[PDB]
Amino acid sequence: GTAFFQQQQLPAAMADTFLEHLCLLDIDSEPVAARSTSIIATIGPASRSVERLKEMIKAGMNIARLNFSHGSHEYHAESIANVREAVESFAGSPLSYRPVAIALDTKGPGSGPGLSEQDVRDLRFGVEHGVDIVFASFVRKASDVAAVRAALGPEGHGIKIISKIENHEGVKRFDEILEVSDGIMVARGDLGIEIPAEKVFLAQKMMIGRCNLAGKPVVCATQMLESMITKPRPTRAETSDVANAVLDGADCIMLSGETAKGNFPVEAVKMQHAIAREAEAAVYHRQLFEELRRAAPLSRDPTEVTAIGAVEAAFKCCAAAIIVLTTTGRSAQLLSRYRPRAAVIAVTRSAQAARQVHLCRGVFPLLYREPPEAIWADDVDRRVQFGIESGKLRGFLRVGDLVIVVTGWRPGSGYTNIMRVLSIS
Amino acid sequence: ELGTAFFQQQQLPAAMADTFLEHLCLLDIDSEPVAARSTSIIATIGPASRSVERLKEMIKAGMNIARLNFSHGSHEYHAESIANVREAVESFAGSPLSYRPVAIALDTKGPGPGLSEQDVRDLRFGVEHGVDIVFASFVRKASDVAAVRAALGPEGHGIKIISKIENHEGVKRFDEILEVSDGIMVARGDLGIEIPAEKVFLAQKMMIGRCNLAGKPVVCATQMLESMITKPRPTRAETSDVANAVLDGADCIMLSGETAKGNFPVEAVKMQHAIAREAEAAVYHRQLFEELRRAAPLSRDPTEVTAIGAVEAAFKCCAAAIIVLTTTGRSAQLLSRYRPRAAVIAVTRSAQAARQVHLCRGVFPLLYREPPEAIWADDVDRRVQFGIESGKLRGFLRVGDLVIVVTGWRPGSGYTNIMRVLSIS
Amino acid sequence: RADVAQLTQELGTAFFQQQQLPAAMADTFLEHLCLLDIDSEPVAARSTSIIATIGPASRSVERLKEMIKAGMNIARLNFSHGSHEYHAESIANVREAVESFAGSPLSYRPVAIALDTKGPGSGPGLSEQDVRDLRFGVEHGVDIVFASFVRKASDVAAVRAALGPEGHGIKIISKIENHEGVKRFDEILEVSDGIMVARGDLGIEIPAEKVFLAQKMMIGRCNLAGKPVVCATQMLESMITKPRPTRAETSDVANAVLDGADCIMLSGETAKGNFPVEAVKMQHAIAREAEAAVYHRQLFEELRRAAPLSRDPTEVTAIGAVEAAFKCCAAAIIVLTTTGRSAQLLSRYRPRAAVIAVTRSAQAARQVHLCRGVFPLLYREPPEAIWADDVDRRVQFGIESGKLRGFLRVGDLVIVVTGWRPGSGYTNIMRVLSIS
Amino acid sequence: AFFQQQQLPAAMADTFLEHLCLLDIDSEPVAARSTSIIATIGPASRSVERLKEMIKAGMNIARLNFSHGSHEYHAESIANVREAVESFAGSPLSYRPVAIALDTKGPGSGGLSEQDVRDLRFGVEHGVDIVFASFVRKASDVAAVRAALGPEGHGIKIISKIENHEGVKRFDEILEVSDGIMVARGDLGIEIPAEKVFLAQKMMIGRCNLAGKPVVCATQMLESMITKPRPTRAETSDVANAVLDGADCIMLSGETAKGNFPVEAVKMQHAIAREAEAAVYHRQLFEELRRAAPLSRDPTEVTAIGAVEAAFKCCAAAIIVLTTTGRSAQLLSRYRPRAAVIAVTRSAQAARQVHLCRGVFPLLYREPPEAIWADDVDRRVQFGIESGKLRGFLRVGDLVIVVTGWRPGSGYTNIMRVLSIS
């Protein structure tokens, strides 16, 4: 229909130049796709009640950040419990259940050179309490990441390490840090104090671009809607900043004081949700996909190979979604790196992976709870049908839509290799 | 894993180039072609190439399609030629390494207002003798194609109609002619007489580009190696012309007097084979694929959607081949339209389709003769392995190579929707 | 590397590390972002003009002198507040502070004066207060009018009519503040001299989360049209009370420049803020960083692909001059202009070289601040008897001022844009000159 | 109607593929033929009357193959060429200069052969403009030819013929020290596999285009026309593709030296080149040439790109350039403008040598210098406009780009002007 091609900035996406693309942006072109940039919300006095946390999950919060610079282990354990209670209050309807990751933000070293003793204690707390992500403060070199990995021990092997770049050394040794990290956070608060305030946008734009190139999650953090700590609506600069972090290529956007101690924590999440949707529709996918494709090296990994084929096929048919079966979340991450306009609906039995895929832009995790079928092929089809039913319920899909289904040839992680074009019935 | 020596062959340094100009600068005479020759050779069969023994040498030299010019000879004469071609082709039906299906094409005499009386009789002859292709002479408008289609009696509806564009009206009505034809022949002999000789290259380049855009086979014909009718080696202009027809985007190249009446018919086939191999390696796939992609409209046909995904995946891993199961040849044709550097090995039970897919650049047909398995999925795997083993048998594949496998979800033509990444074992 | 090998040997590796030159050489936009370096210092003069709203915090002649030194190019008078007596006093103080530097014409900085109207209201036709304020502007010699709540092309015609016959030289920058203005943008831009993205009212009239779409669209269309575009409101809002801005604020300013804005504005930050000089200094610091980070390779190519063929020698000379400047890494493009049009046409192709515009018109020298990358020089000498000699004196004035202000150094290449006969509309010559 | 001619719909295309699709056989070429024709002079094309027909047909350079004939024979040919050329000198607004090129025999089993030294000394004594040096294998071979030309032969252009595998492999070092290259396909097709010659041709042309140096495509281009009045489909294709490859010059060997239709062969190359030049995808070409060309601090280099850019912007009919040595015109030519580069020069040798550069139309200025240098410059610019108007390049109302310098002499080009005709 003609009405379909007027929505989600499709006239601006068809443009032959980036300049023409900007000229074609329409304020009356409504976003249709689900919001793909994840929202990380910092937990605190303003956002700890189980009832408040339920409203924040409904508003769009995907990751709950526990800032270990404040409060005790007793405090942070109560936080975790409330978050888990609010998340599990929706587990009765598995077709609409939304998993929420739990991230531990470390205090950092200070006048010291290596992992603080407090950081070791907090890291072991995180492992003991089952945190999904670690935002490692003041990462200056690759050995800092290794020290955090060591402090997580053998049981914390599944936790994701997102290195916070907060100073000039971190920016200068970025490549070696990214290589050993699972992703990066652009920690603008300290970065804006350690380097000239007028140079932070260069570091942000550079780090996001390099993470996009590497296929690793990148978080944009600090003062994004700061005025919403006290004021019910944000400034013109604030909405612009959020929209531009998405347009830069950020996988996640964050709320610090806006959710931890503010008067508008649910309003702050709803505002980030509203802006991200508008900004994602305004992304110039034509140039973006082409540049991501050109820059990405040749691969002999079937998962990587299937991922680019699936993304290419999704663009060809205007696929509503790409449904992927994933154990560790890697298959979904590899789809996400090519920035498809189609939602990546990731069906997994791993609750940890379902929470951790929120770090990847455009990945919508679905936790499958049914016990395995005797016939493996039947188990696969049940999980694909689960993705279709959830996607239909949540508005991602309609009868007649085309979806790309990404699966593998045998059970267990590492074997994705099949891409099938599917019509929704 | 592949080695530096691999990346020096088949003009891979020139293929990596960021500009077309840099691409030309990087062409290396010492970079040997490795891939199988993808541009099919059409050889006109006449007194010089009629004998079963001569035809066997021509099949070994690279002839894929045998052309019978109904402007000369009789029905009795051409039926003898067809019988000899079929006898020479079936002499290799024992050894799968030597066996190659060869299409049989009837070139009509031409019209007068509408279809000639002789053309109706010759077209009826073609149907009765089971010809695969018709090169319809002097096609001027879409009604001419319809008249040929109508002449291909009740039994001839599967024959391919390749419209010969030989005059100014055919060039001017090209779009309407291509829409109703299976493909086009750039009939340069008459075209060089009907229009100024210095304008024929414009018509050739335009028609090839439009056929490439449409995804339909295009043949470059007449005087390609003319001097070789009397001389053992061609001129500098002749080798250039053949190389440039391939670089233009031609699916097939033709030999007329060179094979029909000349003194070196086998040498002419060998020469076209040698040049096509060099020219195909020198194709700038980076710009070509990107432009084919950008120009091709969005599609909701799973076959077309799977085809672009498969070609994308093949480029990503330097896939040795794309093995496709096809009944009509459509699935292979849709892969071919995106000009992959990988060979399209099409496994089919249809002998007609196996001969007709020679019209498509880079399609290597394999006729499957085994009786159907009780389990359809098992019948499918047996055909995929038939593809793989013959591939290994001919030097396309080695254990450890990556291949893209294109199949459908249910039997019968029209359901192609699966793309798998398989490692050769 | 071969496209810069000899020039790298000549200018030095240190030259090619500064002003984001490694990021500018990138083959893709993505690679360009990856190559941005915080250690790559900006060298070029700041090209995006700063508009500062003058109020109680920034009225004193001594304060205004510090703001001119900080980088203020245009002084804005908001006729929504204050009186005619109040605003006339502000204008007088601005003029006094500007003329305090007129003693050295090689370092004198012209400052434009802009009147921001109050706007219509519940009623549509030009308000009676607007007619009185527009008459005031004409009488006081304002250079620009920021026309509030422009909704259609007839609105801009009504403002031009209220300016009268004597206000023909004033520039009309239409403020787009509502949904109607955004929807009828093309018709408004056609009849306006430029546009202001009035984000304050725009953020109230349309959803706050959609304003960035309107900003990016309007800037792109103004860039396409070759007309000045201003980004306004809440750019450094927190600096009204604090000495340092938020991370979102510095980002917003940098992104307005990267979007393609010719001018950036300060409202409450300079009118009623506690740190008006610090706000100007902050916008100056960010704009310089952001201009160096512009991906000129794609930008110039897209401006050329989009721009239609032209048979106007001024337009033709402008693209040739910008192309030549990119080829040699020209330090500046010196242009002789009467109305500012020749400089405006150079500016539309977004050169990295500074457009040093030499003019005898004081009004045009102030008005060219609306054009990104145009550095106006007011020529005060009386005309030479030989016209060709008068032209060469003005070109030499530009070279001497350029050398004086640090724009030029011996050995630099400059592109000189002049015409074949006196008077406006005859620009058609481009020269490559080496600085001695 | 203007935008339907000279493949302008195909030139507006956003992709190369769309460009090919838009090529129109009914779109007539309007601009003058840019690719120069080199004709080998022999028994079939030696008469003064024959040579006059060949000049009118389009011959720009006359080649004398020193592999056959004697010094007495070739001197007679030179005299006949010069006589036929000077028969049109009466009308200087329509006079067409013709270069004279000596093609050496080569070293054969050997450094520089003794016959080559004698022939090179002959060329210097007879005032040849170009030398096509046979079998150039390395940079020292070029130096040996340069040395054999001596002090009197400093002005002669050396076009190195690449005829074997060593020449192809050491191409970069040879091009660096040569004025240009000839893709000598006859010997190349024997020295390397026949099916690999197109790779060497396309590579050499691209590299010469990149370097801004003339490249000639030679041998068997219209071979059948030695005995037949019309060429083959492959032959017309080959000529059109040499132009589309980026060749500055195309050559005729046996076709003009010993063939039955030498004038018809020249006419045929002229007809095809015109069609092929209009079909060039300038959008991609200029952009790639622009991107690839290095940054320069030479005002001639800088003015050249500005002039070509300005010409594309207004659909300039021509770019009129004042040149002493031909360098300023050569630098304009390297950016492949669609506008004709009308080069006004007082040097007769430079006027002949500029035929090596594609799209450069030399005009020999034969008026004595004015007292005021600025007035002398304007007279030469007006000469270009009058000759252009006469030859059909210009019409009143057209826009032209005028490229001049700030001071007399060679190496000072730095000015570009936009001028409206009449």
Ligand SMILES: O=C(O)C[C@](O)(CC(=O)N1CCN(S(=O)(=O)c2cc3c(cc2O)C(=O)c2ccccc2C3=O)CC1)C(=O)O
């Ligand atoms: O259109 C119209 O008709 C025109 C046209 O095209 C033109 C011409 O004439 N030609 C060309 C071609 N060729 S070749 O040599 O190649 C050839 C041969 C032959 C043939 C074929 C061919 O093909 C056969 O079959 C035969 C049969 C039997 C016997 C013999 C024969 C022979 O020889 C010829 C001549 C025609 O006619 O067709």
Ligand SMILES: O=C(O)C[C@](O)(CC(=O)N1CCN(S(=O)(=O)c2cc3c(cc2O)C(=O)c2ccccc2C3=O)CC1)C(=O)O
């Ligand atoms: O290089 C090396 O050595 C090679 C070679 O060279 C090769 C050959 O033989 N050929 C080729 C060429 N051709 S054409 O025709 O063109 C020609 C002819 C002529 C000429 C030239 C030319 O040129 C002259 O001069 C002359 C002179 C005198 C007399 C005569 C003549 C003639 O005819 C021939 C043949 C040898 O082998 O030897």
Ligand SMILES: O=P(O)(O)OC[C@H]1O[C@](O)(COP(=O)(O)O)[C@@H](O)[C@@H]1O
């Ligand atoms: O993204 P990952 O972790 O590699 O997991 C993908 C895996 O999931 C599957 O699709 C299904 O396997 P399971 O039945 O074990 O869930 C495999 O075929 C594939 O290896």
Ligand SMILES: O=P(O)(O)OC[C@H]1O[C@](O)(COP(=O)(O)O)[C@@H](O)[C@@H]1O
């Ligand atoms: O290219 P075509 O003619 O559509 O044939 C492709 C068909 O072949 C298959 O892959 C296998 O089908 P069959 O088992 O009938 O051969 C189908 O699933 C698919 O629709």
Ligand SMILES: O=P(O)(O)OC[C@H]1O[C@](O)(COP(=O)(O)O)[C@@H](O)[C@@H]1O
């Ligand atoms: O930019 P504008 O307004 O067209 O003015 C440029 C004009 O200035 C000149 O360079 C000098 O002219 P003046 O004698 O009027 O100062 C003219 O040649 C040209 O027409």
Ligand SMILES: O=P(O)(O)OC[C@H]1O[C@](O)(COP(=O)(O)O)[C@@H](O)[C@@H]1O
């Ligand atoms: O083309 P060349 O050899 O580099 O020199 C071109 C020269 O032509 C001129 O425009 C006119 O020079 P002349 O006065 O020597 O004829 C010079 O200013 C310029 O240097």
Ligand SMILES: O=C([O-])C(=O)[O-]
């Ligand atoms: O740690 C952070 O979030 C910061 O410093 O911005």
Ligand SMILES: O=C([O-])C(=O)[O-]
């Ligand atoms: O039939 C042909 O091939 C022709 O006419 O060129």
Ligand SMILES: O=C([O-])C(=O)[O-]
């Ligand atoms: O009018 C204004 O300045 C605004 O709305 O921002």
Ligand SMILES: O=C([O-])C(=O)[O-]
């Ligand atoms: O000398 C030549 O021209 C050749 O050998 O091709």
Ligand SMILES: [K+]
């Ligand atoms: K912390």
Ligand SMILES: [K+]
């Ligand atoms: K026929």
Ligand SMILES: [K+]
């Ligand atoms: K106001």
Ligand SMILES: [K+]
């Ligand atoms: K010779």
Ligand SMILES: [Mg+2]
């Ligand atoms: Mg911090």
Ligand SMILES: [Mg+2]
């Ligand atoms: Mg015919």
